[PDB]
Write an enzyme that holds these catalytic residues in place. Structure first.
Site, PDB file in Angstrom:
ATOM      1  N   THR A 352     -54.324  13.765   5.827  1.00  0.00           N
ATOM      2  CA  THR A 352     -55.573  14.221   6.398  1.00  0.00           C
ATOM      3  C   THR A 352     -55.708  13.839   7.860  1.00  0.00           C
ATOM      4  OG1 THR A 352     -56.781  12.290   5.522  1.00  0.00           O
ATOM      5  CG2 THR A 352     -56.773  14.293   4.120  1.00  0.00           C
ATOM      6  N   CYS A 353     -55.111  12.707   8.243  1.00  0.00           N
ATOM      7  CA  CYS A 353     -55.136  12.259   9.619  1.00  0.00           C
ATOM      8  C   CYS A 353     -54.349  13.230  10.496  1.00  0.00           C
ATOM      9  CB  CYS A 353     -54.620  10.816   9.732  1.00  0.00           C
ATOM     10  SG  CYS A 353     -52.940  10.699   9.197  1.00  0.00           S
ATOM     11  N   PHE A 354     -53.443  14.004   9.888  1.00  0.00           N
ATOM     12  CA  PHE A 354     -52.680  15.038  10.618  1.00  0.00           C
ATOM     13  C   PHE A 354     -53.049  16.479  10.310  1.00  0.00           C
ATOM     14  CE2 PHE A 354     -49.529  11.460  10.283  1.00  0.00           C
ATOM     15  CZ  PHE A 354     -49.514  11.115  11.639  1.00  0.00           C
TER      16      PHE A 354
END
Ligand code: NA
Ligand code: NA
Lengths: 377, 377
Positions: A352-354
């Protein structure tokens, strides 16, 4: 089911529109001359200058910066562009209800961001009332307790579920079981601009334990705190503006689900914008069977599942205001990414961070569709 | 069913990609510096300057007019923007296959529009070959006989149906019944820039009657005329360019349905653009229950039905190149229009010269959805 109670919604809608009166007492047009780049402050001044709100109910004649378009279509643009600003939390008047949510709630600290905040809420209520009056939709969704408050309906525990499942499940657990093992007190954490304040739900609350005897009072107080008690001057100011255009007794023919639909329409994700601003990695590309299957499967999903998919991959169900080109991750700008990963017997995964879907190379369309839906659920 | 034979498509796709070779014999990047506003002529010059086509198989490094984007994403933009030009009939190289269609065919008069037409077809084949090589899709759809000709498959009567139903049904009628009552001859009308020419299908054809004995020859000749015999130098030039990047024996692993999907993806209408550029009349507006039902029903349709809906209302299944803002009717610019009309017991109707749906005020969502689908079919 897609529009439950639609028979009754339309019946109320017909009644409502018959009861709305267009005065013949007013000018032919209400005129606005605006710059797209300055729409929020310019519309505030123009709308808040009018002393007889009935003049607002004249045919809207809005121009930007061009003369050869439909005026209804341009009003629809103005409502859209201005929604995007009024509801932008940058102004401090509204805020997103949670990081993973797109729904808006009144910011309880609005008066600290802007000394003239109530004037702004009145302006906003005038614009919402104007939208309903002229049959336009707003671009944004408020939390369910906002619509309830417009209608003077009591906010309840069940109103928490759509906003914060985790917290709703906790409060529901407490309602249904002996709370004593939880060691809770009648106080709550309140975060204001990065600073946390313990606030008492009731006098000396911080020292009063929650038990089987008082747990219902505890739940009510929390709900009051979470949705009501901090924003009444805001909401009152908003309702003053709204009812300059619409009698509150007319709007109150609708319930809260009908009112949302009337004001805001249905939520969804624009798949064309989504698809045009996605990147492929580790062997995928636009013509790849797995990618073409992917986008068709997304298009076949209901609105709610597409939103769940977006949240699954990005951590949030909200789309940047300028659409998918401006998608952000943990370390700045990061377009939505599908990377070839794993074995076809695995389910897709997300980082999710990417904003990155890890998508195995499934062997058929039906397998991809089934494995993707399952991951999304 | 949505992607029939997808197991086999992906199997061929994997095999294909393994057989494609990226030479280590070439520069790291193939560079293009272009202006959006001049993309067709500028790309022609850059692509047609290269004498060793293997240098094209280098990583594409395309820049417009800005440096901070994904190169794959920008190549994808270049392919999209340039497709929109290559396939624009303004250039005379391709034309729409019928007024109600969006599918493209080679314009048989291309050499009259442009003395250097074959050079352009080669350029186009180079760009299509480049797209497949790098895994990008083109923006446009060719008629089914185009894909067949790329693959050296014979064009048949059944290839007519997807292009022109009326004419296919006529030719099928002739195949299945005694043609003599029709009084047909072995000649056909050919329209070239507004001028009609009777052309003989076979020597002195104009005086030879179609009978039970010779009707199959008649059908074959018509099909030849309609799809093949007029465009072989074009198609040959296109194939010379395409096969500078892809060996014809590799591409020939695909059949014609697979080849379309590989090259062009799936056809659809962008509902967000559609909805944003529609006008409401006679009592409708964006928040009206009937309108909100309408758009949800459109979104729930398959791609094919949305296309049929667009054709039902506008007379054509094609979308203007710049999207719905530029929709045209009989008397110039005319946005897609939904007008309140009729009784809820009637089906919707269209005035195609005005891009206008006459939509009764149905009483529920389900009624609107059912009556709309029926009208569309
Ligand atoms: Na993210
Ligand atoms: Na039309």
């Amino acid at each position: 089911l897609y529009f439950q109670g639609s028979r009754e919604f339309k019946q109320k809608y017909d009644y409502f529109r018959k009861k709305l009166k267009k005065p013949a007492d007013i000018p032919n047009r209400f005129e606005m001359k605006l710059h797209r780049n300055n729409i929020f402050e310019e519309s505030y001044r123009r709308i808040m200058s009018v002393k007889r709100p009935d003049v607002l109910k004249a045919r809207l004649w809005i121009e930007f910066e061009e003369k050869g378009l439909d005026y209804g279509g341009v009003a629809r643009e103005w409502f859209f562009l201005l929604s995007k600003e009024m509801f932008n939390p940058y102004y401090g008047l509204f805020e997103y209800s949670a990081t993973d949510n797109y729904t808006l709630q009144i910011n309880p600290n609005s008066g600290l961001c802007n000394e003239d905040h109530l004037s702004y809420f009145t302006f906003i209520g005038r614009v919402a009332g104007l939208a309903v009056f002229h049959g336009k939709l707003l671009d944004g969704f408020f939390i369910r307790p906002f619509y309830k408050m417009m209608l003077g309906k009591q906010i309840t525990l069940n109103d928490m579920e759509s906003v914060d499942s985790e917290y709703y499940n906790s409060l529901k657990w407490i309602l249904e079981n002996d709370p004593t093992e939880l060691d809770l007190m009648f106080c709550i954490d309140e975060e204001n601009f990065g600073q946390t304040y313990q606030v008492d739900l009731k006098p000396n609350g911080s020292e009063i334990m929650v038990t089987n005897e008082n747990k219902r009072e505890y739940i009510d107080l929390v709900i009051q705190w979470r949705f009501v008690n901090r924003v009444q001057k805001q909401m009152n100011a908003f309702l003053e503006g709204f009812t300059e255009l619409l009698p509150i007794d007319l709007i109150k023919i609708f319930d809260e689900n009908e009112l949302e639909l009337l004001m805001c329409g249905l939520g969804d994700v624009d798949v064309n914008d989504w698809r045009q601003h996605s990147i492929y990695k580790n062997g995928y590309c636009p013509n790849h069977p797995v990618i073409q299957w992917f986008w068709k499967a997304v298009l076949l999903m209901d609105a709610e599942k597409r939103i769940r998919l977006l949240q699954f991959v990005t951590g949030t169900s909200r789309v940047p205001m300028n659409g998918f080109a401006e998608l952000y991750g943990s370390n700045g700008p990061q377009l939505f990414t599908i990377e070839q990963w794993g074995s076809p017997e695995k389910l897709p995964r997300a980082h999710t961070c990417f904003n990155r879907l890890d998508l195995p190379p499934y062997e058929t369309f039906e397998d991809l569709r089934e494995k993707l839906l399952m991951a999304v659920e």
